[PDB]
Homo-oligomer: A and B are copies of this chain.
Amino acid sequence: TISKEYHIDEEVGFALPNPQENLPDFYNDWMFIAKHLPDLIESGQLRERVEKLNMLSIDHLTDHKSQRLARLVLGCITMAYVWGKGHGDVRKVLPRNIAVPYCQLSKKLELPPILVYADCVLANWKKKDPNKPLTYENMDVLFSFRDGDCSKGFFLVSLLVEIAAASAIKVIPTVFKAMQMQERDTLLKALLEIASCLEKALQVFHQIHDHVNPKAFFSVLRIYLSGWKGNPQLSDGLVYEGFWEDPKEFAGGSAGQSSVFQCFDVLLGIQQTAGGGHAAQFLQDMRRYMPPAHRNFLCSLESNPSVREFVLSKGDAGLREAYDACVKALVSLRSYHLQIVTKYILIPASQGTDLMNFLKTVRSTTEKSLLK
């Protein structure tokens, strides 16, 4: 089994298991702002409340779960401060009373000082009833940006698909041990088990229609997910007052920072990060925005022999069929995702085109990996 040092959970996988809901009393001033973003943004009192804060030390965040909650809290406040109401007026400087401890905590956790997928998706959740299962009805997010932003639906549906895909992670050690031991039948059962997990993850995906609406996603949520890397609104980046002299550019929160999807492309030999193209460059850059243990996990998978090369080298139709079942399940997920992105991004934009090409290039690379 996968070492504890990789921080992969048996149940939720790359998601943070049982995230912390509240910070120690020393940080109640941060917690008040973060828990009241919809009202403080709408009223215009948010930027003032941030500017009125006293610079706190990160020294009172003892455990990893408190450090991860503080990252989500500070990250949500930073996005809200920079974008405000999201109708034009951008703040180009992050005050030192928040930027200093944000960059300090970010340096400790080896993550950039910007809200990432690991903050608003992997750590932004809770069970309503701990005795009930991990289903949409029994879950909620810790923070939202605005009322009606569909943040709960967007984040929880991504999280539920992450957990659905995570069921195949435990099969990875079996795949590599079966190749080493030359256990052909074991590798076939293992590849077929991974395919069924990825097929089950596509069924989970269907919930996106019931908890997100195109208008709220396109006109509201999108604003707060935006970063400052190649953005004309902050052409040189953001100033992290009292930490850096020059403004630093960081990419916004992306599902391209999800370790589960990157790990199945690595596992199946789908060279998503190879080729020198924009899609490959983006996905490689997004690894720097993943928790360090999860970034280490992906590299360890790349250090292991190629499952695709092994299957190609065997002249075994059954083994090729099992390998192709995994690849087909990934093409199916990415093809369904493209239809969702057409409904939620492409069509609302007409009532953008680059995101379609990025997803189509990623999907095409997966399709071209089929042995047949």
Contact = CB atoms under 8 A, between A and B. Distances in A.
A274 B112 CA distance: 9
Contacts of A248: 275-277
Interface residues of A, number: 25
A288 interface: yes
Contact of A276 (B5, B249, B277): B249
Q: Give how many copies assemble into the complex.
A: 2
A297 B296 CA distance: 12
Contact of A110 (B5, B110, B274): B274
A360 to B, nearest CB: 14
Interface in A274-299: 274-277, 281, 284-285, 288, 292, 295-296, 299
Given A276-B112, A276-B250, A284-B288, A302 B303 contact: no
A300 interface: yes
Contacts of A302: 292, 295-296, 299
Interface string A204-244: 00000000000000000000000001000000010000000
A250 B112 CA distance: 27
Nearest to A303: B296
Contacts of A300: 299-300, 303
A299 B293 CA distance: 11
Give me the 3 closest cross-chain CB pairs, A-B, nearest first: A299-B299, A296-B303, A248-B276
A277 to B, nearest CB: 7
Contacts of A277: 248
A285 B300 CA distance: 17
Contacts of A276: 112, 229, 237, 248-250, 288
A274 B108 CA distance: 12
Interface string A295-319: 1100110110000000000000000
Given A248-B277, A274-B110, A299 B303 contact: yes
28 contacts: A5-B303, A110-B271, A110-B274, A112-B276, A229-B276, A237-B276, A248-B275, A248-B276, A248-B277, A249-B276, A250-B276, A273-B288, A274-B288, A276-B288, A281-B285, A284-B284, A284-B288, A292-B302, A295-B302, A296-B299, A296-B302, A296-B303, A299-B299, A299-B300, A299-B302, A299-B303, A300-B300, A300-B303
